[PDB]
Symmetry: C3
Amino acid sequence: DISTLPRVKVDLVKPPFVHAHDQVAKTGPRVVEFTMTIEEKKLVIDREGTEIHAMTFNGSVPGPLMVVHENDYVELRLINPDTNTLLHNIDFHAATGALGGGALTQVNPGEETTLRFKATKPGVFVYHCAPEGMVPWHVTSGMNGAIMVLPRDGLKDEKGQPLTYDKIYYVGEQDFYVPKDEAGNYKKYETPGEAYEDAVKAMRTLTPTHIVFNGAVGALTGDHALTAAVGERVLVVHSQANRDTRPHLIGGHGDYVWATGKFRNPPDLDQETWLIPGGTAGAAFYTFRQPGVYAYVNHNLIEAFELGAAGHFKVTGEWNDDLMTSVVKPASM
Amino acid sequence: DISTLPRVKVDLVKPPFVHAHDQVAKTGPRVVEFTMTIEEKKLVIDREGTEIHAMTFNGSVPGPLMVVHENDYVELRLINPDTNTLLHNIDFHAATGALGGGALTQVNPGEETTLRFKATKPGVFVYHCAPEGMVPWHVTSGMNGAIMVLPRDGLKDEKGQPLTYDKIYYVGEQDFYVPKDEAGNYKKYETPGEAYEDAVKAMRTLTPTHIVFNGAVGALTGDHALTAAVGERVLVVHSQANRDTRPHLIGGHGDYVWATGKFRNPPDLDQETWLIPGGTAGAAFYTFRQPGVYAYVNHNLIEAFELGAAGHFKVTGEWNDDLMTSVVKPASM
Amino acid sequence: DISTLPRVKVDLVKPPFVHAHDQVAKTGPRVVEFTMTIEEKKLVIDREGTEIHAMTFNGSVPGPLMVVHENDYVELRLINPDTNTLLHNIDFHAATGALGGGALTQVNPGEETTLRFKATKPGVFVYHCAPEGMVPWHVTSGMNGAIMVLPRDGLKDEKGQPLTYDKIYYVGEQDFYVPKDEAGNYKKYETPGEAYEDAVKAMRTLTPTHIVFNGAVGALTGDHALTAAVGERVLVVHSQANRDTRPHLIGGHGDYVWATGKFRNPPDLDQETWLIPGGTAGAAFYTFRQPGVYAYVNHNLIEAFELGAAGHFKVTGEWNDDLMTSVVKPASM
Ligand SMILES: [Cu+2]
Ligand SMILES: [Cu+2]
Ligand SMILES: [Cu+2]
Ligand SMILES: [Cu+2]
Ligand SMILES: [Cu+2]
Ligand SMILES: [Cu+2]
């Protein structure tokens, strides 16, 4: 049976970008093959040069977004090179059985493995590393990403009418818990193992030191802001593998939102802000109507503006005065 | 076009009360004009006399509730008198473009401005101050409120049947982060600027020192409890501009609840407790069936009973023994 | 009227198990009688022997799950034996009036009382102790449980088709705040009253020291794991009386989920993780398709793996290779 199915190999791209795919399936079920290489590496996460030992899927935080269709088979080749120091594995919330695949994918440095699973449910799901005994440490070190399982006939609104996006971006939100000394300065370590004991004490406080989008404070700002034009329909997939978040587009809305990200449910309309529970991926669809800069944020404003959970969208086009206008510009009373 | 539309000026009232309005629109689209004056002032927030420098819209925490209908134009005159010390602005989650109006409304002390925007989406939305660089500080100092955009044909249940309320109250929930000395006593400052540096360190802990309704511990209790009678239908609008909350009416329910507050979505029925994400306004409809005192609370009971997030409802009417009755009054075994 | 109704006495069972009942009602409305005895007792909650003075309904944390049908009358006999030291009462979120019954059920040691209320709304609800002035202390000491009010015609899916479970389990999640000394070691007390002052200071930090299922770290693991077989439909009721949680079945899904637990609303489909607000009970339905061990967790992984919020399911049956298979077992590159 599977033997007889067609197979296509797909090369992943770095977040916030997403690999090429079809919204409405043009072929029947296939075996979609992906390859990911584990990379343990130092990462500076803020302006002051704070550095951590990140554990990544393909060298990025978050790991890349995989896109398949309902009932395709996902075949993943997972490689843990001998240059790494720790055992890793992968748990797909999209999969059924063996702890999401975690029990079947344990690889020490120098090993690789190939897992296959059937994508039976449509929606966006979180995938993350989960080794017995050190699950939170690997997850909060950036070892998580997401997979989107699109219905074979694409996305639909509450009335069952088609929703087609022109652009899609993947925003992975990460809560970090950097160990601190007595005065409050962040500690630095030579290897991941040296950090272990302190990491556990830092996590138990339940208070992140940093909460960032795309691995670093300001990662999606300035020259890295997300782009769009007035009239374009944009799908924003957002994931948080360990902690709740409440996304919000400043100056815009979520026209259609699947906060818990499962496509067989009708979306919520006109959301100002929505809650994505820790351990979940969600998606929001919006059509831009005004040009300018928009701030995309976690709406606990302390987490957004003090801790790092803020990004930008720069949109081009003509301003619509009917929607909004400054009647009297700021001036002396 | 707008030139030709009728205009009505509306005078706002202090929370928890709401200005007069029509549920079902009797006229066509209009330009609804409001005026708000910014007021920086000292506020004692608890029984022990803890004082803070609040930043308010119209002298209250939360700012007043504005009520318009879908497709009306909101025209707001915002005045920042010379008696204030800081730059302020306003961001309406109900608006589209320019950061909700934040980029078009920056006024220093002694200035004013007039913004107009089209209310294209029905629901309850949060509005708040958001100056570049000090967003969380202004929000957590009480500078936020809400606006309700009613469908032109009023509220409806899941089956599309009309829902008419007899009374409406606005509960604004506020998380405060008062700086403390080494022993745990709250600090006091002469001006807002003197508090700034300490405020930022207090916010980064992510742990509020107070969480109150209507600006102070016990604000909606005793002689200030909300009132109703058995048989009355009450709509309770609740907003939290920075942090999640989980409202609950002790002894009652939320018969119809729009937790994320957007009216084009059908409401949830029979809720015991519901989650309103930080940066959102929600609404719950309930018909009183028993007289007596009801406690309206944030259901994290520590936040409610230790931190200040609790209010009362005193309802008049006849007791219904079919619904509830004490069969055997407390007595010695 | 009530005089004329049939009455049935039901003996409760210890969580995670649930007392015998009918899903679809075979008789008309009845007066269902229950008896609960309050028990103040020492409980060791972790591996290191940390001990607390728990306040319980029937000797367990959580208290037992009560199951009735819509429009039955619940008649509860509540006994507070003279061996206890504190005043207690009970508040049913399922009830209407008198603070959920809290104002009618205050019993000092040596007293008892009998309350009756009509179960007018279907769903799973939280019930908990709530004495004036010490509400959070009694709740966070384990004095809470849940009641399920089933529609008279059983559970249904989004299309109104019947959903019948073969097994049902009740998972009560508890956040504990154990007082600590300067070095971080947990304190021990002789009686509940001796703990009082320190308990309040511990709660105000808003940071639990332990978050457990069924009263202790590892309570639902090893020989106490929940059981099922491939093909069985299982309903898992989960409650959190004071704090938000985000349940997740590792290796599975929530096929039908009522996150806020009210049955008149259609369930959410295919959830990976769902949010149950503090002060609420929810229910998830799933059909097992793969055998093996599954971890049932609160998906804030620090709370699950560091703090205690983790349990197991051991399922028997044949492995399905179509759903998942290890193509290449872990081996040297
Ligand atoms: Cu790993
Ligand atoms: Cu997971
Ligand atoms: Cu301001
Ligand atoms: Cu905002
Ligand atoms: Cu008690
Ligand atoms: Cu309660």
